[PDB]
Amino acid sequence: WATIDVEYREPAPYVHAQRYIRYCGIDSRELINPTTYGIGMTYHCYNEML
Amino acid sequence: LNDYLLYMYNTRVQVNYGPTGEPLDFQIGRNQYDCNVFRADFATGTGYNG
Amino acid sequence: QIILDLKIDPGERMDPAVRMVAGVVGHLLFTAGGRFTNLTQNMARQLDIA
């Protein structure tokens, strides 16, 4: 809802599928520490549910 | 090093990615220090000693 | 001369009951401006998100 799910990135190793699936607007490019990654982060569907 | 300056286990600082997809192509931190210079370049020796 | 900084270990960083009280208490215990400082630049950041 009012977000960018799919973003087409620069040419990928396999040239037939070069899409980036970003669930709820998370540009997950870095490695994840599960304690300090989701601090201060939200999206449009989750705010309009609260 | 691209998987070390981005695995943030303290509070996450901001990061602005470059246009390409090369490693160490970003600007990290609050004062936005350029991280492109630490890539190897054998005609100048830009990252390492010398 | 002796400043202090919070630990890294999860389980207490994910505990919302400990993390909420330790933000309220921390503003009444330490001095973080003016002349001297008991905290670190990084620790006092985690006591505002708390």
mmCIF file of C-alpha atoms in Angstrom, chain A residues 35, chain C residues 6-20 22:
data_model
loop_
_atom_site.group_PDB
_atom_site.id
_atom_site.type_symbol
_atom_site.label_atom_id
_atom_site.label_comp_id
_atom_site.label_asym_id
_atom_site.label_seq_id
_atom_site.Cartn_x
_atom_site.Cartn_y
_atom_site.Cartn_z
ATOM 1 C CA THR A 35 18.825 -6.080 17.590
ATOM 2 C CA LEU C 6 26.812 0.082 27.277
ATOM 3 C CA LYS C 7 27.454 -3.540 26.395
ATOM 4 C CA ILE C 8 26.806 -5.400 23.148
ATOM 5 C CA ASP C 9 25.133 -8.615 24.350
ATOM 6 C CA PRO C 10 21.567 -9.238 23.113
ATOM 7 C CA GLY C 11 18.773 -10.566 25.288
ATOM 8 C CA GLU C 12 18.969 -7.454 27.427
ATOM 9 C CA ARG C 13 18.941 -5.203 24.372
ATOM 10 C CA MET C 14 15.788 -6.994 23.187
ATOM 11 C CA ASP C 15 14.087 -6.914 26.611
ATOM 12 C CA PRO C 16 11.569 -4.040 26.426
ATOM 13 C CA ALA C 17 10.965 -3.858 30.169
ATOM 14 C CA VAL C 18 14.630 -3.430 31.075
ATOM 15 C CA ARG C 19 15.299 -1.122 28.133
ATOM 16 C CA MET C 20 12.445 1.248 28.993
ATOM 17 C CA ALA C 22 17.079 2.094 31.858
#
